[PDB]
Paper text:
Two additional crystal structures of AtPHR1280–360 obtained in different crystal lattices all revealed highly similar tetrameric arrangements. Given the fact, that AtPHR1 MYB-CC forms dimers in solution, we cannot exclude the possibility that the CC tetramers represent crystal packing artifacts. However, we did observe identical CC tetramers in three independent crystal lattices and in solution. The observed oligomeric state differences between full-length OsPHR2, AtPHR1280–360 (CC), and AtPHR1222–358 (MYB-CC) prompted us to investigate the putative dimer- and tetramerization interfaces in our AtPHR1 structures with the program PISA45. We found the dimerization (~1400 Å2 buried surface area) and the tetramerization (~1900 Å2 buried surface area) interfaces to be mainly formed by hydrophobic interactions. Both interfaces are further stabilized by hydrogen bond interactions and several salt bridges. Importantly, all contributing amino-acids represent sequence fingerprints of the plant-unique MYB-CC transcription factor subfamily and are highly conserved among different plant species. We identified residues specifically contributing to the formation of a CC dimer (Olig1: AtPHR1L319, AtPHR1I333, AtPHR1L337, shown in cyan in Fig. 2 and Supplementary Fig. 4) or tetramer (Olig2: AtPHR1L317, AtPHR1L327, AtPHR1I341, shown in dark orange in Fig. 2 and Supplementary Fig. 4) in our different CC structures. We next sought to identify the binding site for SPX in the PHR CC domain. In our structures, a conserved set of basic residues maps to the surface of the four CC helices (shown in magenta in Fig. 3a and Supplementary Fig. 4c). Mutation of AtPHR1K325, AtPHR1H328, and AtPHR1R335, but not of AtPHR1K308, AtPHR1R318, and AtPHR1R340 to alanine, disrupted the interaction of AtPHR1 with AtSPX1 in yeast.
Author numbering:
A (entry chain BBB), C (entry chain BBB): 312 to 355
B (entry chain AAA), D (entry chain AAA): 312 to 354
Write the structure that this text describes.
Amino acid sequence: GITEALRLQMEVQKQLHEQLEIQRNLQLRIEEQGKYLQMMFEKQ
Amino acid sequence: GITEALRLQMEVQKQLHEQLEIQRNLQLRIEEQGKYLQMMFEK
Amino acid sequence: GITEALRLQMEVQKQLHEQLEIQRNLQLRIEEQGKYLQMMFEKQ
Amino acid sequence: GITEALRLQMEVQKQLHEQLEIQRNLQLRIEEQGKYLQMMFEK
């Protein structure tokens, strides 16, 4: 009973961590785009 | 100017798609845990 | 025991649904930016 | 052109911040469930 709930909890937490990693990468790409757009605005 | 903005937009959207895929996997693991907990409650 | 695990499962699932809603909104803002950038590229 | 691209970028980043906040809440609920399951296993 509890053994299997814990196995499934660990699978949830594994997937959570993959989501957190991909989210930081997305944040970085979005922030890079923002810096570039801002640069092009400033330089004209 | 615009060429590079589009390149960076495509990289954002690539990362977004990977986020959507990992989110469906997370949803599935959470839904599976919920179904199991509910099963054990009913039993 | 199991009663409390189910209460906490429902809180996880509540937060999951809020994450899914915010994610669709983020996708829409990103897709709108893409359409605008593409428009400005095409029109020159 | 660029003014509107920046306006839309700010709206993307606003939504991103709301996603980060909801993600920490989700992480907390998941971590709380894990700690409880572990506690009940140990007991």
